[PDB]
């Protein structure tokens, strides 16, 4: 349940994440100097992704322990 | 930037077009004819900030494109189809055709939704670009 909630958080945050293509000077500048809002969005995405990976690790460990017991 | 780029001329053109509204028309009429002006202004619009904020360039582009139907169609073609200039001749090879930004979207929206004799034709051109694309 917790990992599903974390995945939903990451999904909602990523659905608003956009990647400009590297095909113009303005996009190149976006990548050269990441704008502040992009920095905050990336920080939030990293936090949510770390939460998702930790909960995924815990879920797989719990599943393997349950398999040990079964 | 004014010393090292062409942006100063665009700031002058924006001042001429916008400073006194009652003269805008006349200024636009004097500015529309010059060859490759719309291509150059679009190139400056899609370039990284060089001393002129995007809204002013957009105002210049819209006011030129709206001063007659032919120029409006040319601006639509520049934004959607071919933005290159029409060893001394302007080239403007550097930018991919049809790239979109907030500025281009706003310009196209204003061209389509501005009510004047050319609006139909502009819409027509827009729709053409759609069908051709499809």
Curated annotation (Swiss-Prot), chain B:
The lineage of its organism: Eukaryota, Metazoa, Chordata, Craniata, Vertebrata. Belongs to the BIRC6 family. Expressed in brain cancer cells. Homodimer; antiparallel. Interacts with RNF41. Interacts with DIABLO/SMAC, likely with higher affinity to SMAC dimer than SMAC monomer; this interaction blocks the substrate-binding site and inhibits the caspase inhibition activity of BIRC6. Interacts with KIF23/MKLP1, USP8/UBPY, BIRC5/survivin, MAP2K1/MEK1, RAB8A/RAB8, RAB11A/RAB11, PLK1, EXOC3/SEC6 and EXOC4/SEC8. The BIR domain is essential for its anti-apoptotic function and is important for binding to DIABLO/SMAC and caspases. The chain holds residues 3322 to 3461 of 4857 of the full protein. Ubiquitinated; mediated by RNF41 E3 ligase and leads to proteasomal degradation, impairing inhibition of apoptosis. Deubiquitinated by USP8/UBPY. Autoubiquitinated; mediated by E1 ubiquitin activating enzyme UBA6. Anti-apoptotic protein known as inhibitor of apoptosis (IAP) which can regulate cell death by controlling caspases and by acting as an E3 ubiquitin-protein ligase. Unlike most IAPs, does not contain a RING domain and it is not a RING-type E3 ligase. Instead acts as a dual E2/E3 enzyme that combines ubiquitin conjugating (E2) and ubiquitin ligase (E3) activities in a single polypeptide. Ubiquitination is mediated by a non-canonical E1 ubiquitin activating enzyme UBA6. It comes from Homo sapiens. It is found in: Golgi apparatus, trans-Golgi network membrane; Endosome; Cytoplasm, Cytoskeleton, Spindle pole; Cytoplasm, Cytoskeleton, Microtubule organizing center, Centrosome. This is Dual E2 ubiquitin-conjugating enzyme/E3 ubiquitin-protein ligase BIRC6.
